[PDB]
Design a protein that fits this description.
This is part of a larger assembly, with one copy of chain A (484 residues) and six copies of chain B. With 484 residues, chain A is an all-alpha fold. Chain A is 70% helix and 0% strand. In chain A, helix 11 packs across helix 12, helix 12 runs antiparallel to helix 13 and helix 13 packs antiparallel against helix 15. The relative contact order of chain A is 0.08. With 194 residues, chain B is mainly alpha-helical. The radius of gyration of chain B is 24 Å and the shape is flat. In chain B, helix 3 crosses helix 7, helix 4 crosses helix 5 and helix 4 packs antiparallel against helix 6. Classes of the chains: A mainly alpha (484), B mainly alpha (194). The structure holds ligand YZY (3 copies), cholesterol hemisuccinate (2 copies), calcium ion and zinc ion. One ligand YZY sits at the interface of chains B and C. Chain D: This is Short transient receptor potential channel 5. Chain D: It is found in: Cell membrane. Chain D: Belongs to the transient receptor (TC 1.A.4) family. STrpC subfamily. TRPC5 sub-subfamily. Chain A: One of its GO terms (molecular function) is store-operated calcium channel activity.
Chain lengths: 484, 194, 663, 129, 52, 117, 44
Amino acid sequence: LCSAKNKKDSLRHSRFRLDIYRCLASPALIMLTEEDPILRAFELSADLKELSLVEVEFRNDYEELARQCKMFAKDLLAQARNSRELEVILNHTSLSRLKLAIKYNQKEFVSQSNCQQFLNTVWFGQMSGYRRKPTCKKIMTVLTVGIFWPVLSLCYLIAPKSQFGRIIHTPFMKFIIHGASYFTFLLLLNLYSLVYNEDKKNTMGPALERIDYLLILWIIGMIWSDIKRLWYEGLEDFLEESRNQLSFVMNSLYLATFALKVVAHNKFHDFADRKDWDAFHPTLVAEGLFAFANVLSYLRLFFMYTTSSILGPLQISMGQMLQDFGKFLGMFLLVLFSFTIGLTQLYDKGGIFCEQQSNDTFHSFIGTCFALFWYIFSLAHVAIFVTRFSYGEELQSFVGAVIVGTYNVVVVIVLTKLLVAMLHKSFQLIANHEDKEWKFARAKLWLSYFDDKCTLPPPFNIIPQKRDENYQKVMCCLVHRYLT
Amino acid sequence: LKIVAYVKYNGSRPREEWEMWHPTLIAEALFAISNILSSLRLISLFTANSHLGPLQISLGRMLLDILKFLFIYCLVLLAFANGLNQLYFYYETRAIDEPNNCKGIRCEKQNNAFSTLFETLQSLFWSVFGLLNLYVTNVKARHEFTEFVGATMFGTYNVISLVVLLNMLIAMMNNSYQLIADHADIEWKFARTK
Amino acid sequence: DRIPLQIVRAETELSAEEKAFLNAVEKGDYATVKQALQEAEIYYNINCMDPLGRSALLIAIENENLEIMELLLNHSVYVGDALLYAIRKEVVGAVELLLSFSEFTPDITPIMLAAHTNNYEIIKLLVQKRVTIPRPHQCNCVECVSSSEVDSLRHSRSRLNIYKALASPSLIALSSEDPILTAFRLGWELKELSKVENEFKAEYEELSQQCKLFAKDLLDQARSSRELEIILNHRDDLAKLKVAIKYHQKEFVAQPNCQQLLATLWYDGFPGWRRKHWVVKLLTCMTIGFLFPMLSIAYLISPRSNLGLFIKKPFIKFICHTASYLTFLFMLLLASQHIVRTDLHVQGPPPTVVEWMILPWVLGFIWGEIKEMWDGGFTEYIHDWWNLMDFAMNSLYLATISLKIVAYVKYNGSRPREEWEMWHPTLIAEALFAISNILSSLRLISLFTANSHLGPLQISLGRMLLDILKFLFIYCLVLLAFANGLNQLYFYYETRAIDEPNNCKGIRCEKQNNAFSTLFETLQSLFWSVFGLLNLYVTNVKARHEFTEFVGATMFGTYNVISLVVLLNMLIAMMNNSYQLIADHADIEWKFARTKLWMSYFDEGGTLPPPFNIISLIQNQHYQEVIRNLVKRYVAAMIRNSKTHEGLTEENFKELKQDISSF
Amino acid sequence: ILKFLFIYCLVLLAFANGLNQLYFYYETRAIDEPNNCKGIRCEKQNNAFSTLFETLQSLFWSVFGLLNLYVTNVKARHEFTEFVGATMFGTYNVISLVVLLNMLIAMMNNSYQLIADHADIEWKFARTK
Amino acid sequence: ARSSRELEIILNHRDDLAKLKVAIKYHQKEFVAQPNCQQLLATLWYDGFPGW
Amino acid sequence: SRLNIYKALASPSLIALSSEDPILTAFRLGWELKELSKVENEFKAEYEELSQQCKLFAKDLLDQARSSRELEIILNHRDDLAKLKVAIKYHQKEFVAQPNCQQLLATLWYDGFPGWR
Amino acid sequence: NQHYQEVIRNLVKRYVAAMIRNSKTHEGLTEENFKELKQDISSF
Ligand SMILES: CCCCCCCC/C=C/CCCCCCCC(=O)OC[C@H](CO)OC(=O)CCCCCCCCCCCCCCC
Ligand SMILES: CCCCCCCC/C=C/CCCCCCCC(=O)OC[C@H](CO)OC(=O)CCCCCCCCCCCCCCC
Ligand SMILES: CCCCCCCC/C=C/CCCCCCCC(=O)OC[C@H](CO)OC(=O)CCCCCCCCCCCCCCC
Ligand SMILES: CC(C)CCC[C@@H](C)[C@H]1CC[C@H]2[C@@H]3CC=C4C[C@@H](OC(=O)CCC(=O)O)CC[C@]4(C)[C@H]3CC[C@]12C
Ligand SMILES: CC(C)CCC[C@@H](C)[C@H]1CC[C@H]2[C@@H]3CC=C4C[C@@H](OC(=O)CCC(=O)O)CC[C@]4(C)[C@H]3CC[C@]12C
Ligand SMILES: [Ca+2]
Ligand SMILES: [Zn+2]
């Protein structure tokens, strides 16, 4: 039936829908008609944001209504006066309210002082005296807890209810223990080459060392925690975080190198020098994947900068400027493909990694793309002598030099300066919300350690009406304070 | 160290025959570093001038953010250095096997650039200024897969270091200077009063 | 566990009768105040003041009730500084009534405060009583010296107050015979003061800007071209415009009507130049340049003829001069062709054809430069940066000629060029000629101000060169420090030219060697590393001392990081900030520069291109009648813009309701 | 960008004129060079400032750091001439890379900010065209 | 405008979308980029593709 | 409660009425409020605003000198330029950079060279 | 100390008056207008 009306008059149909939603998003109407005004503002705000995407022409009007809904629920929370009211609001179920705000992207609600004060008490738990300690005393506490992480993780395993058993239960020490567990995994990787026997460099079927079994235990531990997080939350929620994505690729690369290593030891065990092996021998392929996965292991430490209040806001700012880099990739990718077509047409009829670079880099599509790629830096990686034809072609050598010179001006002088111009413009807009964005990211990271589902570090994990009436009393107080 | 060297050694000897840890060489190096440090103290006299004072103060206030940037760059550099050293450490060659008895990248023919972690860090540091040649990723045994992986990792490191981080730093430094410029006079007058 | 709160500095409290009198005064009940004052006279206080210091007269003034103020004055109440308080509120009636602890410094007079408030009516009312203002001194006089030593704060305040009073637009309009010239001179003098008194810079700059704005806004009231020509041609020919140019009045010069008169003067002999297709203008510019020799020769042969008068128009002058300079540059470009010069092994060469043709141009440039400098004087020559460039270029040309003469007389025979010494006169002459060519070809950038698209950009770029020197000082200091360190480290391993291959020593050889072996070479090597032209192997040493090589490499790396990651980005940020500030006033600066360029061709003193060159009471009466009209229109305008308040109208409507009730 | 390229072309022409005036007395022949290659597109660069066209080509490629530093040397080894030529090259490098490029950066920054406020309207006009 | 019929009448008036073409000729960018005109143009453009 | 007490104690009128030395009280209160902003991260903005208000009150109180004798009396008070040293110790940049204080410092620094400017 | 307390007394008095000026004059004038208008007419 609605489709029939849209055929007769679509401008009138769209205007009526926006009129209704603007009436529903009235702060006065929600307070007077809804039983749970805080939850109503959360759901409506997520509802109005989706409508902006579909209604492209009404984009501006809808995102103004969503912003109005978000600011209303934040002002309602600011009227809380003591911790008893704060705990009632943030624990209600229809920290369910606190988790619901994170799911609905309520950044203003989270950054409120009442919400921030509540988070600090839960995060530190029974160790509230940590905040009274001086800076010199704080570091000695973190280092001591981190160094003795195997003991504390073991104590919880045998005596969970003991004094040392309950240490992990507080979120702050759990974050440190998990952090120190990962730092030892990176230390094992660094020591892998140092304890490598030199006689195994010429061995084609080397067996697994004791250090290799240690890394296998960690990898299963990291993997095991990954299904648990995915199973308890879901695919879309788990895939959204960048740290989770980097764990997917590096875990598959670690399984591939060890699967290839076992097969190689059982098939190819010959004793021959390294210089005589095949290019695509399984042992050489195994080492290529291992090196690649080591880069992705060290790059996971970016999320640990969010906790710091000095490097935290800066890291979040750099994350939001990566979206502007993707748009420039699309335009530059076509320019690189255009000059590759012409350059390989001129020279193939008639590489750069040698000590004496030659014209042979332009004799293939892959070689031409690599040569043009290294011109972007402006550090003189490739010489001009490459453009000269080996036998003669005086005229064709000059034309090829002009083509390369045009590429340099277009990319190094025009495209690069344009990229800097937008980063100057975008950063100024981002700098405005630097504090609100960082606090939302830090609270999201803290909330993951509140759940007791995952408590042990990765090597150890593998081893086996009454409240609704109280909520209404607080709600009427908050509503009536807000009106006044 | 000069007094110790005077007391200990009492004879003339060709300089090329001296060992690596001779006291005279250490004393000379420390003296040169002292000269560098001494000559840089003249910047503190700029606050007495009304033209070069506020600029010096503003440049001083802009050094806090660069360190925060350098921490993140250090993380990236450590990651890529670990990866490259893990890939390339099997093909380490001795100094005798190389021309002119070179090892490292301080030679006309750069070699063994990714054989150790310290040398890998030095090699990745010098790529920012374009002083590392592209043939250092080649392998004598001529294995195509290893060279391809090494070249890809080197290119990715170069892209991340020189195309993203430098422009981000440029934009950040632009924004910070504009805010600092507003209060230059009061800070310069406070410094000159001190 | 508690902080006691108690008044520390206590003041005597008023009596109950005095407080009641104060409340009656504030309530505006004349009968109650009359009864209280009569009782006070019977008992034998109106002189009482609050702890705040607000007396009954001050409250009466503050409430703007003329009746209570008139009655209180009739009873001989203390006056004190009531006139200043009445003036500060800007109420005329209280001021005329008054004429018929404190909130002000003791050096302030009623005329000073009236000028500060910039109220035309009150200032006019005070001037009729023949008030005076002290003239500030320019100073090593004993009076100024003693006043400065005795109390510097009072002296500085008083000077600032006097200059604030003098720079009032209303006072200047009301009491000055020549408001425009007064504004010009006051703006210049106030601008000079901010440099001497560093602490009070901002207020003096603000006053100077106010004077400039007043002078600019007075000219906007002209309604006809006759008035504009009277204003601009008044002599105390465009004398007023030249005076404004002398005092750096950019806004006065850049007014649209003043620019229209100048454009009309500039395009003499070209009606409807603006109404032409760009092609027609380009063709017109090309043909006049081609015919430039004929026009110049015609003027020399017969000035009276039409072709003689054609060069007199300023635009034709500009085109002919540009064409002559372009021809000179093209002839310079042609002197390096090997076709002209046949032999290269002659120790003393007589001049070739191209140099013979070139020499008259150089002589003309020198003669014109010295004539201009002699006519203008040293200061005006030093003021413009371009004149310095001309002086350097002409000095280099003269040195080239002088060196060429000595070589020809001293040397007769011919020798191979490889056998000559390093300090041969021919080589020095050639190097000087090349530097002169570089300098000459860069003078064309000064012609960019005549274009509407390339002019403002050139002005903006030229305004950004002051900070670059500031950064260059710091960079030079850092470079000297690191060069000292590196040369201290590396000077023990200096080799000879014979030991090196090809017999080449330095970083200017295919294999770089001895990069840090001398201070001069260290400076050169550290300069070239900014552009990446220094190879990394120069830090190695033959003896293979690993510790020394590592220390040198770390020094080099630290220098590279400091120079390329910190200072370059700092310079980028600083020049970005400066450009945004400059861009907001680019149009006015470009118009000022173009106006200065235009008036250089209005004079008939220098007409020939360089190669050809070597071969009043009634006027005061009309000015005063125009100035009177401009001031009258100016006053009626500024009142309407800012001196218009809705709140003042509100009480007037209340008074109208009071009058309707009385009726 | 074209407005800036005008100024850059003027500066380049001036410096090319000066360098070619200085360095044209020492032109060699192609057969006198190894591999019989003459110019800056050879394995060892030579005759960089011998002709005006070659001088323009050499000064263009020095913007990207593709011109070596030994091209300022001469076979006769006249130290004064080589020092003057190196000083000219260094002055050109400083002017072109430390000044003009950064001014271009600043002007592009300013122009983009004004343009950005209307990007949506212009894009939609182009799209409906 | 409050209804689609009025918008069609205004945009299609001829002294085919003649008024839109006249606006394009005169560089009326703010007029053309109005949300209602864009909605109508998108309806015309994505014909045969409901809910694209 | 702590924030309310600290906000009450930082009122310029209360300091003027009830303090024996308003300038020193403003200095100490500003320093203490600046130090509290780091410990109490939840109320950083409020404490920073209070510290700024205290600094501005001290500067504006200094701005009301009408003679050099009063300026010398204020600057030389000890509980040699003792008050200036106390201001420097507490990072009172706006107080130090006042034009009259700068003029006095300049006449002290340029001793022996009258009319140097 | 006696001289210092004398100078502090003068500075505080000047500071109080200056800050009162920005707060008080407009409000006082507006209040005196309408209030005076609405009571004297009633008395008449
Ligand atoms: C995605 C689209 C973005 C915008 C694209 C257009 C950008 C505007 C510019 C276009 C580039 C035009 C081609 C310029 C280079 C021509 C090739 C070349 O010279 O190769 C050397 C070749 C081969 O040696 O030599 C020549 O072509 C001989 C003539 C050279 C004369 C000197 C250079 C003239 C001025 C060029 C200025 C370029 C900008 C520099 C800014 C600092
Ligand atoms: C003008 C006033 C300036 C005041 C000071 C400003 C800040 C100066 C601080 C700079 C940090 C310098 C840290 C040491 C680097 C230089 C020593 C060196 O490596 O020499 C080579 C030497 C010898 O080959 O290398 C080493 O000794 C260790 C090499 C590995 C460690 C590299 C450390 C990198 C630090 C950050 C670099 C950032 C590069 C740009 C990123 C976009
Ligand atoms: C459109 C026109 C814009 C003009 C803008 C001008 C801005 C200011 C620049 C002036 C140019 C300076 C020319 C002289 C120095 C360059 C020539 C030279 O060194 O010759 C080498 C020659 C040959 O090796 O050697 C010398 O002349 C002696 C050694 C000099 C070493 C110290 C150089 C001091 C100046 C360094 C400036 C660095 C600027 C970038 C900093 C990141
Ligand atoms: C080959 C060598 C000799 C270099 C040749 C350069 C000339 C062909 C160009 C370079 C810059 C040009 C100048 C740039 C700008 C102007 C302003 C322009 O201003 C006008 O009067 C016209 C525009 C307007 O009405 O605003 C007049 C020409 C002129 C001097 C140009 C004259 C021709 C010049 C000197
Ligand atoms: C840069 C390299 C080559 C070192 C060689 C130069 C030095 C001799 C110069 C560089 C910076 C100079 C200083 C920069 C500024 C000042 C402040 C100046 O104080 C005033 O007279 C300021 C007057 C004003 O406010 O304008 C006294 C000299 C002094 C210390 C200068 C002393 C001489 C210095 C150390
Ligand atoms: Ca001249
Ligand atoms: Zn005097």
